[PDB]
Ligand SMILES: NC(=O)c1ccc[n+]([C@@H]2O[C@H](COP(=O)([O-])OP(=O)(O)OC[C@H]3O[C@@H](n4cnc5c(N)ncnc54)[C@H](OP(=O)(O)O)[C@@H]3O)[C@@H](O)[C@H]2O)c1
């Protein structure tokens with residue numbers, strides 16, 4: 001109905017973010033029982049999206065779903081399961097899309113539990129890292145793609161500074177996050193040439209103040225953590241705007257130094273050869 | 276005995292490559308039945324190294340082993356098996372080190388069979404890519420590390436331009452090669468702080484004229500391929516000199532553009548904070 005005539009607007013030749021870009025949109029959020037995943041569920045609810053949230057803990061997901069509905073979600077549902085289970089991953093998306101009658105955005109956020117430790121002999125954690133953090137994202141993507149091709153939708157992949165540069169104590173985790181870049185940046189190029197109108201947003205996040213991260217770094221690293229609330233909002237904005245990469249960190253020097261113009265230029269040369 | 280007094284030498288304040296750096300050294304080469312792996316076996320034989328070569332095809336490995344001995348290898352052995360089998364991977368190294376009485380260099384070269392195709396639905400190839408191309412390298416590394424800690428030896432990891440930048444048609448392969456960078460660059464940092472004197476050399480190679488690559492790219496990509504013989508030699512030189520990364524490509528613009536000074540600087544800042 002009413003407007004707010006005192007609220008400022010900017011002048012342009014073009015485009016910004018508005019919540020209406022998510023109003024009535026059909027969105028899956030994975031790892032949504034806590035942290036950034038949960039915050040993203042909430043933001044999307046407030047924007048009047050349809051949300052399907054997932055994670056292992058059904059009891060906490062019930063709470064998220066309940067709060068989503070309170071905040072103004074168009075609809076809110078959960079399906080419980082582990083992303084170690086590739087059959088679940090595949091069935092979760094089909095079930096999520098039937099609930100909503102479609103899919104506009106796939107937000108891939110979950111990771112297997114990880115701590116800061118030097119590597120020796122924990123091959124299982126390495127495999128489990130690759131399966132949960134990387135392989136399930138590929139399985140979810142494959143299941144989701146027919147629906148996303150219909151809606152010209154978006155895949156949002158949550159990664160890390162440790163998915164662009166190296167760090168000790170997180171080798172397995174870092175390997176999986178690098179793998180995400182390798183894989184999705186490659187299919188992004190494939191979609192460009194096969195005219196698949198599905199955007200891919202890789203999100204490169206510095207340290208975020210979730211309980212899990214703050215516990216993991218206690219006494220080992222002494223650094224600023226960015227607020228989980230806005231981090232979650234920035235992820236959604238990047239995906240909604242169909243941006244290839246999103247950067248979010250407490251430090252602006254860091255966000256400066258994770259860009260790779262050489263790689264952009266090398267890839268630009270390969271595709272100008274193709275063009 | 277004799278010298279060659281007409282052969283030139285350079286002036287310095289320090290260091291170059293000499294074959295003697297491999298004389299009597301104990302070296303594992305994986306994927307050594309053909310291509311770059313086989314060429315590396317040969318180079319090492321000529322330098323009078325002890326070699327243990329592996330791959331699935333025992334009949335071709337017998338030939339490699341035979342030619343290695345002819346070229347002047349200190350000793351030459353093969354152990355056949357698939358790197359899909361993590362128990363084999365682990366047992367191969369123990370068996371290889373017993374054969375040689377130690378280990379100076381682990382050369383990780385093998386990949387699972389891959390072709391140029393757009394990605395859809397081949398989740399098995401993606402998993403198999405991660406297991407063979409990435410996971411087995413971690414298992415081999417873990418098995419090998421006690422021996423390498425003894426000899427202050429070296430791990431040489433064969434990667435690709437598709438392990439530093441993105442390319443269509445090789446998403447699964449690219450994901451695994453990115454994973455290698457993530458993982459080994461991280462443990463390199465860990466070894467630095469835990470005073471583990473084992474070098475890690477990540478090799479970033481452009482297109483090489485092996486039969487397998489040349490078949491894979493026929494009619495799809497029209498580019499120069501560098502000779503497999505020298506590529507193999509450059510890999511060995513980089514590892515012997517304990518260099519963190521090696522670049523080899525037909526094009527010098529390409530080798531210019533795969534360096535990432537931003538990443539070096541970001542990591543340099545993290546370790547100056549630690550220092
Ligand atoms: N926080 C940071 O400082 C930081 C920095 C860089 C990147 N990131 C990235 O941001 C994302 C979220 O981070 P966060 O700190 O908010 O993590 P978090 O709070 O620990 O949440 C992880 C979520 O994934 C779910 N999950 C864990 N294992 C699962 C499994 N096997 N199958 C299905 N779901 C599983 C968890 O729910 P259940 O346990 O109930 O299953 C939880 O909801 C991750 O991708 C992370 O790598 C975070």
Ligand SMILES: NC(=O)c1ccc[n+]([C@@H]2O[C@H](COP(=O)([O-])OP(=O)(O)OC[C@H]3O[C@@H](n4cnc5c(N)ncnc54)[C@H](OP(=O)(O)O)[C@@H]3O)[C@@H](O)[C@H]2O)c1
Pocket residue numbers: 305306307308309310311312329330331332356357358359383384385386387388407433434435436480481482483484485486487488
């Ligand atoms: N050639 C290029 O243009 C190029 C470019 C960039 C990077 N590279 C990298 O260079 C390395 C070698 O390349 P290449 O072209 O010389 O490859 P290649 O000729 O096809 O050799 C691959 C080797 O790995 C072995 N292998 C395959 N599957 C295996 C398995 N499951 N278990 C154990 N061994 C297995 C093969 O022997 P069996 O079949 O008998 O097992 C073979 O000896 C690879 O790491 C590749 O990614 C190559």
Ligand SMILES: CC(C)(Oc1ccc(F)cc1Cl)C(=O)N[C@@H]1[C@@H]2C[C@@H]3C[C@H]1C[C@@](S(C)(=O)=O)(C3)C2
Pocket residue numbers: 111112113114115116160161162167168169170173205206207208212213214216217221223
């Ligand atoms: C930005 C990074 C690189 O922060 C660091 C980590 C380690 C360092 F050495 C330095 C830094 Cl800056 C990062 O991604 N950290 C996360 C964080 C803390 C740990 C490790 C990583 C996974 C989690 S998780 C998902 O909750 O399992 C656990 C959450």
Ligand SMILES: CC(C)(Oc1ccc(F)cc1Cl)C(=O)N[C@@H]1[C@@H]2C[C@@H]3C[C@H]1C[C@@](S(C)(=O)=O)(C3)C2
Pocket residue numbers: 386387388389390391435436437442443444445448480481482483487488489491492496498
């Ligand atoms: C340098 C790269 C990126 O060359 C390209 C590949 C695809 C492109 F689109 C462009 C370019 Cl430049 C590269 O690594 N190619 C190899 C080569 C050819 C194919 C794919 C890759 C694995 C093999 S293999 C190991 O023998 O399975 C098969 C051998």
Ligand code: NI
Pocket residue numbers: 004
């Ligand atoms: Ni109002």
Ligand code: NI
Pocket residue numbers: 008010
């Ligand atoms: Ni404004």
Ligand code: NI
Pocket residue numbers: 279
């Ligand atoms: Ni002579």
Ligand code: NI
Pocket residue numbers: 283285
């Ligand atoms: Ni000279």
